[PDB]
Amino acid sequence: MTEEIAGFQTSPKAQVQAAFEEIARRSMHDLSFLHPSMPVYVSDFTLFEGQWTGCVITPWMLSAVIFPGPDQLWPLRKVSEKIGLQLPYGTMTFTVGELDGVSQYLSCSLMSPLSHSMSIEEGQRLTDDCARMILSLPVTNPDVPHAGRRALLFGRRSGENA
Template structure:
């Protein structure tokens, strides 16, 4: 990939929000899957184990994000490839990406499109629950190799029980 990853010494919420607000204005402005009642917002970015971890809400998707915060473990991942990050609740697959003004980051898609959310407050409440659940020990033993699968984790986080 191009340039080395930007290491964020401080909370990356503002640059993440700015980069995705720009994407919303420039690339996603007239995309039909965008939810007109939602805006770009970062939720719960936390410095953990040399990484910045948080949720990004946009009108088109909600993603769990990992950005470099000093850990040597963060490395660029080619677009289309994944990396697994382990958290207290389990291990999850993240895809690599790079964005001008932000640099390299990894993301785990949570929701897209965003039609299930009535408004910004509802999306924010789910994002906050995701962050709380991410750092909590699993309630039940994981059944998938390498940890609980993403669908099971987020169904539990949203209080919707086991996957179908």
């Protein structure tokens, strides 16, 4: 078959976030398209099943998200199809989503975080705890030290490298 999905270098984390920021606002009928009042957020972590892992949280939902790993040529899938993935959490079907700025990706709903104790901190904590949960293995909590440093001693390997 000629139709394919190219592997992702890393997760489209920003595009999943911005799309879900809008989808969380979009609300039809007399409810009106009121703003989310809780910033949607997305964790990115690990190369599980050979594919980049992540979770999204919004006021309306929490869902695991997965993107084909680097230098891969997956076949083109149809949307809303299910793909069985193996996790220590249990073998679980991830549904093929197709989303603007994200293209095809593999996702499943985990819960609706409609608790009255909910806050942006519980949002981010629960995206990371959701990552932990479905990996069933420890993972970097994304509140580490500032990792940026100044660049110095500029150069390139040259010789055998042209």
